[PDB]
Design a protein around this ligand. Structure first.
Ligand SMILES: Cn1cc(-n2cnc3c(NCc4nc5ccccc5[nH]4)nc(N4CCOCC4)nc32)cn1
Lengths: 826, 248, 324
């Protein structure tokens, strides 16, 4: 068996959702911001936000909404986790003591169901009579909000329309009514139903179905003054309400897909719209009052306000202030002005909240020769792309290097006092027949530049037609100084060439230190690329020189230096090249039994291979023979995101289902076969998507640091900006910390009353397993924050083992010291 | 796909046993003894008639590729029966076969099994499997005797007399190389034909085509009387050579 | 020749790796030195010699040589380890079973979740599967181990069943005692849970019905660790075993012993409303509690869902791609 320890060094920073309301008091204006597994509660002021409370939940927050049922003084909070844990929460404050009340809770997962493509949707009735949930295709789940439903029991109504895009409850209806856009073979259509809690079924809805834009994406429930709904698409915005129908199709929105909406004026007169290029719009509902005294919708107008960060959620707060919640970049507070500035913008940034964004790749480098190690991460996407330099000093110090283009891979080349970074920028087919970039960025603002002139694929004769306006990716190798972080050089790769891998190393007997990039020719026609290049560069005297190129028949997904040789993964093959005295790459040996060799890692003459469906396969290079040998394979099938080698026997993996697992050699050499079974001894549900695993530590090492119980240090980066550390334990230390977890879970009150053991249980859609071999460091490190009575309650009847004293009782003060040492590992 | 398991009579002059100096009579006697050994052991163990025959068929085929001077018959027979049990899902433990073989064999005969009988037998399973080319499925005249008899309609007692007499002829042909010369379907017809002659029964009348004097041609296509007579001659020879007479 | 078996040595095939864990032994992959063909090999260990050659292997070596079907795995030949010359007693070498290698396995295609199954894919997959089963059932053989791992799919969309090791012959005119609980519990029929021991061919039908729904839900229908807990889940969906729906349930050994919490009603159509109508009818018939009322393989092939499927179009599923 294996024993390991997981700690969160930096919490998730990406904003996954945000709502406003009256949650902490019926009087204050609140802003609730949701980051993965984290809820932040703020109070809105005239200058900005006052933080008041932050809680963790044992689950990914999928639905977050505020509502106020008749009889309550203030808003209640509904949250549903991605594992279908539902709860209703209440804020309660007793002077200085702030706590969160679980008013109702339960798990709403159906034994039989098909998860929907557009994900979990949750909405609440304007009369707060019920909560609607769209969890599965063909089914609508209703939780009625009666006082007695403390377990959140619910029923399903059969839904004929199997593929639903979005749904909302409507305002101004005699009964609870849903308005939704759905897709069938005849296109996309909008439709309504009424929800009867008494009959537990749908009844005919208030207004008819109409054919709507093929890419209709979002549904807006317009408030009582207008009523009805607005449907947002790629080219058009439409208003629907019985007999009334409007459509505005302004050319400005066709340029970039709109992804978020919020209401500015409670009466529905004004809405905010955002798009994937960061533009912020105002949608205006022009009113016309008839002599009847009735108010109708005359027209719709769209006005461009300015640019924000690409935003997952928008929420207008008050006055001119808007909160911009960003998942791909830094979040913001911005002020909307009535008068435009001299550039034509009505939007002016107030504050910037750090978001490590998607961490595509990262490396650890000791820039200042301190013995510490700082983390340089490839963070953000598109305009928000950045390099982030992170050091410990009690908070983390983060520096931001704007790139304005998507960062892909990073590697440090000390000999050149610089980094190599792979980047991609979006250009659009223009009238010249070439392409034009939407904005300047790192690869265009380099001091010196070069473009690959390889003719290897130039024989072409394969047609790829271009239409004006289509997007294309331009990949470039950036040379960036380690002190100024200035782009010294940019190398632009061939047209339709994607860079997938990057290493910095010496090879063979060649004293020169090279940048080596593995690329793949990507054409929309190909399900999988069949052409690729390996390019060897030398950065010397401010210029990047192409040293050699090797054509491959596939995609160079990953590369790694192997004892003076170059180990590369091309499609279904893993290859080892030698670097000749003629400065060319030569095939030495191959391994072929992989579906897609996506990730690679080396220790000694051993190699770990990560496949799309075949999990992890342990290879070894056999020098006496000059070839590879299969050592062992994990027979449980998994979809890999990144792998790492912990030691000569233990191997770490990351699944696409937000799960972490550890494989080991079966350590029983009875039969050759037994060792060949890489047995998963560790299973853990991280709840975050790991892209990169990297050895190192950010803790300052003065050489005086007490040797911690934990041994080893693997840092990992995730999509939501969470950074974690995995380390190993002895059997004794595991058992102590494991037994303590079970004791802490009985003591610590969970938000929503979510069982911790369920939260960390391995979870794929098909299978679910209890966690094993892993210690939730955050649960252990929360011992220091629980009140003294609870601390002593935890240590009752707690015995140590395998120590200086075989059985040794624990006191509250003994454990406080142990955990405090464990907080120094990160 | 499937191997050919049938030879011509002329070919039996050239079995390994023949070419190592064994004369035709001795190999013939050696085959009867082994087949009857397989028959007697399994009957003592209570084995189904198909299981006995399958062992016997393996046995006969085996000594088409090997010599009786290098492979003692009784070990082979036991091995054939042992495997036949597992193939026909009437399994028996090897130790029980050895026990029964010892009861029926005198001391000289059981000397073939050597010091460790179980081990000498187990070593032969490997060769047997390779020799039979892993062709485990075997069809036997018994199933055809019954499939064809079911289609005869007439005096219930005369047909049952025909079946039992033919059934006995099948059991007796397992001591001969007919299993190696003709498919089981022909054997079933030949024994019906033989019993018909001996009981003075005209089988065509029982068939659906009573005026079709070659009654068998509706069961087995392309069989000349030449073949059925050759089979009958070979069957009655065993009776004339021995002291036993036709069952009637 | 092609008919000569047991003589060719394993030297001719070079071992690449170990593809997976099987029913009774781990499976490997190789290429012939003479032919580039990739194959699949299972090691038969005769070293125990408690009773010679394994009887279960003898079962697989008998049935497969008889079964010929596009949707049934073919055993190409049997090979051996190096044998000592003139030393038959000393020889301890083992035999291997040569099989056609398949590009993908349903267990790894579904577990990863990358694959996407449209209705038309499920149709082509089910039609081939049931046609193979109908072939084997028409030949009066019972598989008894229908599982995702034994289901294999080529990239082209051709499917074949694989490990026939646990399979045994079924006698219709006369019942015989068997080995009771056989199929993986997730896909085991209620009759085996209650110990019918003399199981009918419908045990395989129930399994394939569990597979059918699994394709639509992208999740196994019945997941448990305890036979009673499984019976609870089966009862919650297909209805609890009761004399009205299963007249002969009272004759089953554990009918009184093993009981669900409640007498649940059948909600199969309700819970599976999303499944298309043509398929839902197939599931209701395949997942019928009474083995006597449960549909046959032929009846599944003469269903609206599968009758009009043309095997010329094999609809390969969305096997993984590069942006994927
Ligand atoms: C008679 N018979 C035939 C077979 N057989 C033929 N091909 C296969 C086969 N290929 C799928 C596959 N595995 C891979 C491993 C690494 C890389 C690529 C892979 N592709 N998988 C399996 N299994 C064994 C149990 O685990 C999964 C299913 N069994 C097969 C077994 N018995």
């Amino acid at each position: 068996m294996s024993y390991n320890y997981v700690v969160t060094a930096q919490k998730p920073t990406a904003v996954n959702g945000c709502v406003t309301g009256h949650f902490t008091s019926a009087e204050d204006l609140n802003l609730l911001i949701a980051k993965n597994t984290r809820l932040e509660i703020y109070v809105v002021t005239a200058e900005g936000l006052r933080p008041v409370k932050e809680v963790g939940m044992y689950g990914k927050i999928a639905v977050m909404e505020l509502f106020r049922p008749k009889g309550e003084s203030k808003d209640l909070l509904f949250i549903l986790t991605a594992k279908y844990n539902a709860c209703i929460l209440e804020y309660k404050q007793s002077g200085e003591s702030i706590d969160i009340i679980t008013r109702a809770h339960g798990n709403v997962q159906d034994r039989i169901g098909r998860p929907s493509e557009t994900g979990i949707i949750g909405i609440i009735d304007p009369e707060c009579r019920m909560i609607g949930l769209r969890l599965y295709d063909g089914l609508f789940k209703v939780i009625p909000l009666d006082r007695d439903n403390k377990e959140l029991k619910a029923f399903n109504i059969r839904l004929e329309e199997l593929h639903v895009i979005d749904v909302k409850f409507l305002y101004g209806c005699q009964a609870p009514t849903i308005c939704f856009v759905y897709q069938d073979p005849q296109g996309r259509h909008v439709k309504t139903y009424e929800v009867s809690l008494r009959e537990k079924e749908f009844n005919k809805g208030p207004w008819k179905q109409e054919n709507v834009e093929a890419e209709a994406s979002m549904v807006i429930a317009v408030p009582e003054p207008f009523g009805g709904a607005i449907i947002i698409g790629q080219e058009s915005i439409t208003y629907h309400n019985g007999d009334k129908y409007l459509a505005i199709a302004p050319p400005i929105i066709k340029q970039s897909t709109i992804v978020c909406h919020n209401r500015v004026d409670p009466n529905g007169s004004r809405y905010l719209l955002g798009d994937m290029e960061g533009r912020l719009f105002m949608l205006l509902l022009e009113k016309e009052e008839q002599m009847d005294g009735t108010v109708t919708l005359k027209d719709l107008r769209v006005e461009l306000l300015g640019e924000t960060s690409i935003a997952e959620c928008l929420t207008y707060l008050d006055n001119g202030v808007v909160f911009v919640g960003s998942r791909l970049g830094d979040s913001q507070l911005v002020k909307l002005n009535v008068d435009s500035n001299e550039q034509g913008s009505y939007v002016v940034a107030m504050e910037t909240f750090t978001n490590l964004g998607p961490i595509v790749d990262m490396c650890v480098v000791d820039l200042e020769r301190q013995g510490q190690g700082q983390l340089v991460t490839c963070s953000g996407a598109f305009k928000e792309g950045s390099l982030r330099i992170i050091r410990n000093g009690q908070k983390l110090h983060i520096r931001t290097v704007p790139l304005y283009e998507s960062p892909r891979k990073i590697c440090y080349q000390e000999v050149s006092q610089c980094f190599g970074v792979l980047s991609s920028r979006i250009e659009v087919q223009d009238t010249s027949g070439g392409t034009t970039a939407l904005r300047p960025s790192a690869s265009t603002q380099a001091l010196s530049s070069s473009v690959s002139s390889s003719k290897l694929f130039s024989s072409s004769t394969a047609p790829h037609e271009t239409s004006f306006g289509e997007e294309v990716e331009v990949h470039n190798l950036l040379i960036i100084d380690q002190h100024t972080f200035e782009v010294l050089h940019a190398h632009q790769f061939l047209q339709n060439e994607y860079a997938l891998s990057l290493v910095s190393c010496k090879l063979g007997k060649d004293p020169n230190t090279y940048f080596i990039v593995g690329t793949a020719m990507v054409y929309p026609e190909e399900a999988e690329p069949k052409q690729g290049r390996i390019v060897v560069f030398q950065y010397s005297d401010g210029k990047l020189q192409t040293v050699a190129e090797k054509e491959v028949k596939g995609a160079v997904y990953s590369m790694v230096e192997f004892n003076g040789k170059l180990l590369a993964s091309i499609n279904s093959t893993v290859r080892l090249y030698e670097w000749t005295t003629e400065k060319e790459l030569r095939t030495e040996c191959n391994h072929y039994n992989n579906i897609m060799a996506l990730y690679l890692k080396t220790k000694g003459d051993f190699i770990l291979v990560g496949d799309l469906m075949r999990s992890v396969l342990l290879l070894a290079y056999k020098p006496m023979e000059g070839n590879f040998e299969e050592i062992a394979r994990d027979f449980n099938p998994n979809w890999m995101s990144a792998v790492e080698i912990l030691d000569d026997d233990n191997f770490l993996g990351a699944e696409n289902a937000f799960n972490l697992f550890v494989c080991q050699k079966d350590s029983a050499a009875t039969t050759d076969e037994e060792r060949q079974h890489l047995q998963e001894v560790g299973l853990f549900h991280l709840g975050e998507f790991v892209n990169v695993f990297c050895h190192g530590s950010l803790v300052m090492q003065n050489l005086g640091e007490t040797s911690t119980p934990t041994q080893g240090s693997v840092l990992f980066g995730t999509v939501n900006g969470m950074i974690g550390l995995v380390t190993s334990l002895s059997e004794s230390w595991y058992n102590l910390l494991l037994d303590m977890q079970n004791r802490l879970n009985k003591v610590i009150k969970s938000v929503g009353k979510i069982e911790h053991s369920f939260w960390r249980s391995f979870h794929t859609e098909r299978k679910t397993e209890p966690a094993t071999g892993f210690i939730d460091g955050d649960l252990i490190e929360s011992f220091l924050d629980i009140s003294r009575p609870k601390m002593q309650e935890v240590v009752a009847n707690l015995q140590y083992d395998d120590g200086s004293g075989m059985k040794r009782e624990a006191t509250a003060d003994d454990l406080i010291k142990v955990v405090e040492e464990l907080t120094r590992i990160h | 796909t499937k191997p050919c398991w049938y030879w011509d009579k002329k070919d039996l002059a050239h079995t390994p046993s023949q070419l190592e100096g064994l004369d035709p009579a001795t190999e013939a006697r050696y085959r009867r003894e082994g087949a009857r050994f397989i028959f007697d052991v399994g009957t003592r163990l209570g084995l189904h008639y198909d299981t006995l025959a399958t062992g016997i068929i393996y046995f006969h085929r085996f000594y088409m590729f090997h010599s009786f001077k290098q492979f003692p018959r009784y070990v082979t027979g036991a091995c054939c029966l042992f495997l036949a049990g597992k193939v026909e899902e009437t399994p028996k433990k090897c130790k029980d076969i050895i026990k029964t073989a010892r009861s029926l064999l005198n001391d000289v005969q059981f000397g073939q099994f050597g010091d460790d009988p179980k081990e000498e037998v187990m070593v032969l399973e490997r060769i047997l499997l390779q020799t039979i080319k892993f062709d485990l499925q075997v069809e036997h005249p018994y199933q055809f005797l019954l499939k064809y008899a079911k289609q005869l309609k007439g005096d219930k007692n005369k047909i049952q007399k025909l079946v039992q007499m033919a059934w006995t002829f099948v059991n007796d042909s397992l001591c001969t190389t007919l299993s190696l010369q003709w498919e089981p379907e022909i054997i079933a017809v030949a024994v019906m034909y033989l019993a018909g002659r001996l009981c003075k029964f005209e089988i065509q009348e029982w068939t659906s085509k009573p005026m079709y004097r070659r009654w068998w041609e509706q069961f087995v296509q392309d069989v000349p009387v030449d073949v059925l007579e050759d089979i009958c001659h070979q069957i009655l020879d065993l009776y004339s050579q021995g002291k036993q007479q036709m069952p009637h | 020749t092609e008919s000569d078996w047991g003589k060719r040595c394993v030297d001719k095939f070079d071992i690449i790796g170990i593809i997976g864990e099987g029913t009774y032994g781990q499976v490997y992959k190789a290429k012939d030195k003479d032919t580039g063909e990739l194959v699949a090999l299972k090691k038969v260990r005769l070293d125990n010699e408690k009773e010679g050659f394994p009887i279960t292997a003898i079962r697989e070596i008998k049935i497969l040589r008889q079964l010929i079907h596009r949707s049934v795995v073919n055993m190409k030949e049997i090979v051996t380890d190096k044998q000592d010359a003139l030393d038959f007693k000393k020889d301890k070498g083992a035999f291997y079973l040569v099989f056609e290698y398949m590009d993908h396995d349903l267990m790894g295609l579904l577990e990863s979740g990358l694959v996407h199954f449209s209705e038309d894919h499920i149709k082509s997959f089910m039609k081939q599967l049931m046609e193979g089963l109908e072939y084997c059932h028409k030949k009066n053989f019972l598989h008894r181990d229908i599982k995702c791992s034994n289901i294999l799919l080529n990239n082209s969309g051709q499917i074949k069943l694989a490990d026939f090791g646990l399979a045994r012959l079924y006698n219709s005119e006369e019942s015989r005692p068997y080995t009771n609980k056989v199929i993986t519990l997730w896909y085991r029929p209620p009759e085996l849970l209650l110990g019918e021991e003399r199981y009918t061919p419908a045990i395989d039908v129930w399994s394939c019905g569990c597979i059918l729904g699994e394709l639509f839900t992208k999740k196994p229908i019945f997941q448990a660790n305890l036979e009673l807990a499984q019976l609870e889940l089966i009862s919650r969906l297909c209805g609890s075993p009761c004399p009205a729906v299963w007249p002969d349930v009272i004759r089953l050994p554990y009918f009184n012993t093993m009981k669900p919490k409640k007498q649940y009603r059948r909600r199969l159509r309700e819970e599976f409303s999303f499944i298309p109508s043509a398929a839902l009818d197939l599931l209701d018939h395949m997942l019928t509690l009474d083995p006597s009322k449960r549909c046959t393989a032929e009846q599944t092939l003469q269903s609206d869902f599968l009758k009009d499927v043309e095997l010329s179009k094999m609809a390969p599923p969305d096997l993984p791609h590069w942006q994927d």
